[PDB]
Amino acid sequence: ANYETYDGFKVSEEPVLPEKEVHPSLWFTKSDIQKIKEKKNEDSFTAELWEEISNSPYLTMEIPTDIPSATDSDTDIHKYYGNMSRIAKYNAFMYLMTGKSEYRLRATEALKRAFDGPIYEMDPTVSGSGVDEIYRAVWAQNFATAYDWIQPYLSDEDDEIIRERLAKEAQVVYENLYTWGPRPHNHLSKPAWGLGTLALTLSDHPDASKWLNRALEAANTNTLYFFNKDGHYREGAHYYVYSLVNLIPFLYHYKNVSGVNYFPEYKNIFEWAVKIRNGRGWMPNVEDSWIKPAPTHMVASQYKDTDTDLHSTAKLANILQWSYFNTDFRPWEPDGSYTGASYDDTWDIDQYLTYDSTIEQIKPDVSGTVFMNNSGQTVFRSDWNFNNPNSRYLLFQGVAEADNHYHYDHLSFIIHAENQMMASDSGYSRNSYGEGIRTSWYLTAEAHNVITANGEHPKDVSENTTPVSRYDMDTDFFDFQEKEAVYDGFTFPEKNSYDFSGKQIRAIGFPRQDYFVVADQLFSDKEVQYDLYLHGGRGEMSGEGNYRLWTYEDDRYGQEAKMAAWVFPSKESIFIDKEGEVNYEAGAFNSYGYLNARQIAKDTMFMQIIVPLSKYADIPEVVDLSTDDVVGGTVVKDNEKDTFMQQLNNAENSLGDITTDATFAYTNENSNNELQHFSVRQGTSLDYKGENIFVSNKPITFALDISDETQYKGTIAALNETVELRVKNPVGVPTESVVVNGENIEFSVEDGYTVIQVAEGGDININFGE
Ligand SMILES: [Ca+2]
Ligand SMILES: [Ca+2]
Ligand SMILES: [Mg+2]
Ligand SMILES: [Mn+2]
Q: Assign residue 710 a region: left if phi > 0, alpha if psi is -120 to 50, beta otherwise?
């Protein structure tokens, strides 16, 4: 695996230290302590956080006199060091907050026994090690913080004892960082940030420069490969958070101690979380990952002067704050831990220190649909509303595969709608990484909403190159994007030769921002078996033929609802009920019916119509009108008729009322059977009930709203070259102006058609008189 060729990001590796150690300084200085003591009164959140911190059993519990030996269990060794690190930090904090004698003495004894017992005898490279580098990252930060807090009040003797213990761990971590974490996944980054904290805490120590430098260097190999520039983490949402447990602290530590502010460079990893959040603010169960909340509140404070694409006026800080507090947290009751480190972390304290009660929660005001084509994720989204059943979310997953925690999920999609999790990724595993079932089922292509060729998963053209996106279109009435993967390309584990050569072009549309069309083009040099899979998450599957219905109940993840799906072409495909597990969090696995549609063909097409519905809503009337060269049908929902059409070539063909040369075409009618909206992929003409709507001298991709006879409005997808587009005006109405990207463009009117040269795409208004 090549760790240098992904389009990630890195920061300066130059170790900046202060002239002289100040303690405290990691989170705050001496002056701040009374403000931080007062903070508990600001609002109900700081109050609840104080209530948790000040009743911590790590204040009262007996410091254990029983040091464990090398041959004890890996759980007990873990919990010992976890507890010792926690005693030190919780007590060092409550000393600063209350001054109580007991707290300073406890913190001091715990710090004097920091990394005592068998840790340095044991081997962290051993699988399941009780002293694994991912655990002693948190320990190192817990002990370093406890010291930074209690150092002033130590004796000269105790200071030199505790400094010798921390400095040892630091040296050990420094020497074994690249041996414990030979590949640059979160097993390298987490302890590297741990070393970073230790280096800043003991800034005066002679080796602190070497320590910090390696810490930054090691972390940069994670952010270059596993992170995209646009913020995406390729180990998925669960391991992203797991990374944040050690990253967020270090980011603050290095600003507060050395005045190196990296919060601008790491900005996107927080914006990313907000862009992929579902209706209840959960990040998706994609790759080795559960559903996750994004702790964006803990960094909101640093982005008060940062602009975002997510609001017209407001600053990122207000969106980040809105995101966390507009999350359903019920999946993490009654405990409340979503970090994964619930033996080691001090999350109540770290939240208390980083939360800003002044930052106003502002909801994003832009279009919900976002295209993050660098990483290869795309979210169709009607609105930003929290816990609203009228919301529609589809994540469209097309990200270059990484060599850790990978799942075969290229051109897959998941759906959140009617407050329930519908069309599904089958999740991480039943419980853990080491289980058989994870390799045999969970990570496999068939566990996902993909199309396989002879069982082969769609994959990257070349290692660390994002699957190509085209024809991005966002509007009020129809969104659209196509992604391209190949079957005879690059994956893990590495596979060099294939019996054939083929590709998938999967387009997804968002008709009326209400339901979804998935239109697949499949090309191959040989006859092969195409297997389409559609998982309906944790639903009771019913239906016969090309139709299926997953019915959901009030569960831990959403409300009573149902998802209806139809697959075209009916007549050229067979439909196979199957049963596979779906798991959104550790331990909660269960079997649910999923559809396997199948063709044997060379070049062919599938189309899914997928419709979220409230419990008792009418099933739409869907009619397959597929023929030899044309796949598509009609949907009659809420008294309007939509018509979808796909083909493989620019050739004039017909389906229902459509006639076009376009490789894809959508049309919407109103109650009155008048064309209201339409979109085309690479068309030069569209007719509806025999009436021409537009023509062009070259192929153009665009969507247009024609319901207002005073103004036609929509968007034109990116353009390589100048196109003469000709749109038919309402009958006996002149054109007053045409606006593309807020600029007037030159227009003539010939035979009742507005005639424009368009040299770049973007939003278009055709403004009409009377
Ligand atoms: Ca993947
Ligand atoms: Ca939109
Ligand atoms: Mg290990
Ligand atoms: Mn998966």
A: alpha
Is 509:516 a contact under the CB 8 Å cutoff? yes
Here the tokens at position 136 are: 């002693």
User: How many other CB atoms are there within 10 angstroms of residue 519's CB atom?
Assistant: 27
Contacts of 565 (CB under 8 A, 6+ apart): 534, 536, 547, 548, 549, 550, 595, 608, 609, 610, 611
Chain-centroid distance of CA 42 in Å reads 32
Single-letter amino acid, residue 40: K
In the 8-state DSSP scheme, what is residue 63? P
Helix axes 156-180, 136-150, angle to 10 degrees: 160
Neighbours of 112 (CB within 10 A): 14
Peptide bond into 18 cis (omega under 30): no
Q: How was this structure determined?
A: X-ray
Ligand 1 is a single-atom ion; what residues have CB below 5 A from it? 407, 409
Beta pairing, strands 561-568 & 604-614: antiparallel
Strand ordering across the sheet containing 468-473: 468-473, 480-486, 502-509, 516-524, 604-614, 561-568, 547-552, 540-542
Quote the crossing angle between the two packed helices 186-201 and 136-150, to the nearest 10°.
20
Q: What is the number of alpha carbons within 13 Å of residue 65 lying toward its C-beta?
A: 0
Report how far apart, in Å, the C-alpha atoms of 257 and of each of 26, 192, 197 are: 6, 17, 10
Distance 131 CA to ligand 3 centre (A): 8
CA of 449 to the centre of ligand 4 (A): 10
**Residue 375 one-letter amino acid:** S
Beta strands in 615-749 (DSSP E): 621-624, 631-637, 640-646, 653-655, 658-660, 664-669, 675-688, 691-705, 711-716, 723-728, 735-740, 743-745, 747-749
Hey, where are the domains in the chain?
1-365, 366-617, 618-770
Distance of CA 493 to the CA centre of its chain: 24
**C-alpha 695 to ligand 1 mean position (Å):** 40
Using the mean position of ligand 3's atoms as its centre, give its distance from the Cα of residue 405 in Å: 15
The full length of the chain comes to 770
Query: Distance between CA 661 and CA 653 in Å, rounded?
Result: 6
Which ligand gives the minimal distance to the CA of 441?
4
Of 167, 428, 121, nearest to 285 by C-alpha is: 428
In the three-class reduction of DSSP (H, G, I as helix; E, B as strand; rest coil), residue 276 is classed as helix
Cα–ligand 3 centroid distance for 432 (angstroms): 15
- Compute how many other C-beta atoms are within 10 angstroms of the C-beta atom of residue 748: 10
Contact 469, 481 (CB under 8 A): yes
Q: What is the DSSP letter of 117?
A: S
> Residue 563: is it exposed, middle or buried by C-beta count within 10 angstroms (0-12/13-18/19+)?
buried
Cα–Cα distances in Å, from 702 out to 512, 679, 683?
15, 6, 9
How remote is the CA of residue 164 from the centroid of ligand 1, in Å?
A: 44
CA of residue 368 to ligand 2 center, whole Å = 6
Q: Which ligand is nearest to the CA of 401?
A: 1
Choose among 719, 634, 723, 422: nearest CA to 548. Answer: 422
- Nearest ligand to the C-alpha atom of residue 445: 4
Ligand 1 centroid from CA 3, angstroms: 16
State whether residue 470 is helix, strand or coil. strand
Indicate the DSSP class of residue 310: T
Yes or no: say if 336 and 351 are a contact pair by the CB < 8 Å rule: no
